[PDB]
Write a protein that binds this DNA or RNA. Structure first.
Ligand SMILES: Nc1nc2c(ncn2[C@H]2C[C@H](O)[C@@H](COP(=O)(O)NP(=O)(O)OP(=O)(O)O)O2)c(=O)[nH]1
Ligand SMILES: [Mg+2]
Ligand SMILES: [Mg+2]
Length: 425
DNA sequence: ATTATGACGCT
């Protein structure tokens, strides 16, 4: 009892820009605001693959990974913005820069771990302590939490329910106890309302957030009430929340490992994991997964919020599916040169903005009819930011995959250059 | 013929 630690030491938030690329296009083109609209890559094949969808279009069934021509069947009024194309490929510069805007605002409040182009984790522990001392026992008003949902409440119209749950929670709060985890979460949620208001004031972008004691619960919480809302998942809400939560919904159990948990153990929901000893879990799933699962199904996770606002690698990738697969030497060279030219542009801007140089170049390729998503992956040294040198070295490092007797076989369905191993500059 | 990425683990 007294010695079972409960993983209530930290306050952690996950902030996700809602349908981010769509919002970027809607800020730039006001004729898209508050309409069903989606963002697409390419236009020739079935109107393009959709990678971002507004909530209005979602109301009609439009999803990511869907062809635009199919989305139009579900939503005939759908508006489409095209990703920029440079050197024959998609170019996401507009959104990486919009993302830097957002991250830079978030960093004013706390240390943030860039988790993706549009979402970060926040370690609010110190900020909550500072703010708690600032209040000096003063009670927390519902006015400070105008968009917060308390998961599990009310107990015993959507905004009406929300306010009821918030009132029940705030009435129960022990404000005089500067060490109660629930109070600390509440204060973190006040600070996240402030962060979200600053992001929207200074960018016009709206976002959702989850507030809890760890990254996995913050991420799960973030998803309970979207869009433009935030959800506080308290330690005490976990047993009910997890009692019907499909295992696949927890970050990192969405794939094969979550499938084998389901199949081997014979369960469906996260909470059912509590009925297995740690050793049993370790035995089925390895020592790391086992320890991690034994703690996670009790709402405990220790992965730290890593202080990292910049990506660790910088990458350029283009698929060549179907009959478009590259089949000659000239083709592989020209696309390696296109890939390297964009890579070089991104790298020079990275060196100048962020004072660092990449030292290693990873070349990945897929070949046609190869099952795997990397038919090959080989590294070479990255010594200068020269597109022609980088493309030439990538070719030198893959060329012994050609089996022709000027021709290229097996045909290539993917080229991919990645710059890694950054050293300060 | 979702694509374009990017973190992270295993060996
Ligand atoms: N090129 C590409 N971009 C992608 C892909 N997946 C996502 N993006 C881009 C487009 C997305 O806008 C952005 C962020 O991805 P999310 O946070 O997963 N989705 P969003 O912010 O759209 O909606 P929500 O309110 O549910 O969070 O990343 C992809 O497979 N390929
Ligand atoms: Mg998002
Ligand atoms: Mg995201």
């Amino acid at each position: 009892g007294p010695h079972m630690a409960t993983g209530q030491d930290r306050v952690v938030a996950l902030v996700d820009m809602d349908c981010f690329f769509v919002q970027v296009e809607q800020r730039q083109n006001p004729h898209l605001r508050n309409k069903p609209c989606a963002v697409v890559q390419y236009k020739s094949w079935k109107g393009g693959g959709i990678i971002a969808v507004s909530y209005e279009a979602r109301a009609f069934g439009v999803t990511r990974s869907m062809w635009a021509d199919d989305a139009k069947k579900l939503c005939p009024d759908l508006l489409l913005a095209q990703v920029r194309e440079s050197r024959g490929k998609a170019n996401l510069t507009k959104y990486r820069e919009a993302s830097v805007e957002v991250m830079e605002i978030m960093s004013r409040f706390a240390v943030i771990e860039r988790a993706s182009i549009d979402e970060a984790y926040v370690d609010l522990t110190s900020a909550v302590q500072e703010r708690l001392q600032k209040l000096q026992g003063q009670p927390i008003s519902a006015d400070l939490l105008p968009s917060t949902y308390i998961e599990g409440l009310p107990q015993g119209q959507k905004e009406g329910m929300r306010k009821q749950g918030l009132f029940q929670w705030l009435d129960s709060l022990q404000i005089d106890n500067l060490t109660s985890p629930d109070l600390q979460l509440t204060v973190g949620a006040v600070i996240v309302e402030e962060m979200r208001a600053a992001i929207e004031r200074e960018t016009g972008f709206q976002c959702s957030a989850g507030i809890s004691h760890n990254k996995v619960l913050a991420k799960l919480a973030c998803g309970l009430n979207k869009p433009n809302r935030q959800t506080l998942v308290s330690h005490g809400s976990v047993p009910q929340l997890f009692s019907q939560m499909p295992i696949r919904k927890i970050r990192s159990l969405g794939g094969k490992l979550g499938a084998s948990v389901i199949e081997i153990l014979g369960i469906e929901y996260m909470g059912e994991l509590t009925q297995f000893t740690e050793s049993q879990l370790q035995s089925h799933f390895g020592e790391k997964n086992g320890s991690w699962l034994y703690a996670m199904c009790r709402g405990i996770e220790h992965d730290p919020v890593k202080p990292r606002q910049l990506p660790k690698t910088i990458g350029c990738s283009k698929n060549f599916p179907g009959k478009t697969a590259l089949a000659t030497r000239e083709q592989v060279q020209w696309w390696l040169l296109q890939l390297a030219q964009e890579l070089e542009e991104r790298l020079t801007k990275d060196r100048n903005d962020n004072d660092r140089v990449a030292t290693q170049l990873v070349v990945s390729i897929r070949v046609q009819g190869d099952k795997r998503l990397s038919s090959l992956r080989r590294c070479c040294a990255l010594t200068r930011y020269d597109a022609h040198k980088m493309s030439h070295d990538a070719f030198t490092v893959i060329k012994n995959c050609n089996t022709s007797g000027t021709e290229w076989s097996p045909p290539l369905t993917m080229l991919f250059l990645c710059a890694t191993k950054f050293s300060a500059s």
